[PDB]
């Protein structure tokens, strides 16, 4: 499916996982930020590429990046 | 409550309507050759092709380019209908080669259980036999529609 990557600029506001209506992102413990949290994407193959996490990302530039390509039956949002 | 889904489950799409819950509609659809599971695909193909090749001769004869020419409108219309029947037969063969290169894994799950193991229509050689029946029915219906314009008590 698509490729979702999270960079070290994330500060653990844990709102990118709320804006994603597909449970692609998850919050793991970290040590590189004050909140001690980092976005991770275990269920990346379930992503469609709606870029709602990029909308919800407050960092400049975006800590979570979604790259389109290699569409599938789950990445195309198909119920048929 | 006339409006309800089929078998009391709402999670499905299609729901049971008096258009579909009418006994006349249900027995008419079940007795159609396409839904006759106990018949060979070539026989239902023969019936379907006969009906469709009989109906296809009409518009070509009546509204053809040579419809004003007496005696040649019917011939041209019927051979164009036969050509259209051959085109549809080629489409049927291509669909049979396409959609049945794999194997189905589940049945149709008819009402109140009792499902047949596998519909012979939904196989590759079964759909090939269905296309063969369809084209045989198509040219036979076209030829019958031609001679129905050859002997006539009215119009054509």
């Amino acid at each position: 499916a698509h490729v979702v990557k999270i960079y070290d600029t994330c500060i653990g506001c844990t709102q990118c996982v709320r804006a994603c209506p597909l449970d692609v992102l998850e919050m793991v413990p970290w040590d590189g930020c004050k909140a001690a949290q980092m976005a991770s994407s275990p269920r990346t193959e379930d992503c469609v590429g709606c870029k709602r996490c990029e909308t919800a990302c407050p960092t400049d530039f975006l800590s979570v990046r979604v790259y389109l390509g290699n569409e599938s039956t789950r990445s195309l949002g198909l119920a048929y | 409550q006339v409006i309800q889904p089929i078998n009391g489950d709402p999670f499905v799409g299609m729901l049971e309507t008096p258009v579909t819950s009418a006994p006349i509609v249900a027995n008419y659809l079940s007795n159609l050759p396409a839904y006759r599971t106990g018949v060979a695909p070539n026989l239902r193909g023969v019936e379907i092709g006969l009906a469709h090749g009989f109906l296809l001769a009409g518009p070509f004869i009546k509204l053809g380019p040579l419809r004003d020419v007496p005696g040649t409108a019917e011939v041209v219309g019927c051979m164009s209908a036969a050509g259209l029947v051959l085109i549809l037969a080629l489409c049927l063969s291509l669909y049979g080669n396409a959609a049945f290169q794999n194997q189905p894994s589940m049945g149709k799950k008819t009402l109140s259980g009792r499902p047949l193991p596998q519909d012979p229509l939904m196989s590759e050689e079964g759909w090939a036999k269905f296309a063969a029946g369809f084209t045989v029915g198509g040219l036979s219906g076209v030829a019958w529609a031609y001679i129905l314009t050859q002997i006539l008590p009215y119009y054509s």
């Binding site: 600029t9 500060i11 040590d31 930020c33 004050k34 990302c57 407050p58 400049d60 530039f61 | -």
Partner: protein
Amino acid sequence: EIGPKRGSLVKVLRPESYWYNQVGKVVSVDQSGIRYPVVVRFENQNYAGVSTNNYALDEVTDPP
């Protein structure tokens, strides 16, 4: 202690940031040793609408 003075104007040299070669005001510098401890506030919003961003020690300098 390890970064610029709080409230002092700094210049952001981060290329991918919206505020590249711009001036921002430091609001807090983290002392726990994180990746981007310097927190600055800009008077002009970005396209996302935010006005604050975090940068490393090497991405901030005193403007002339």
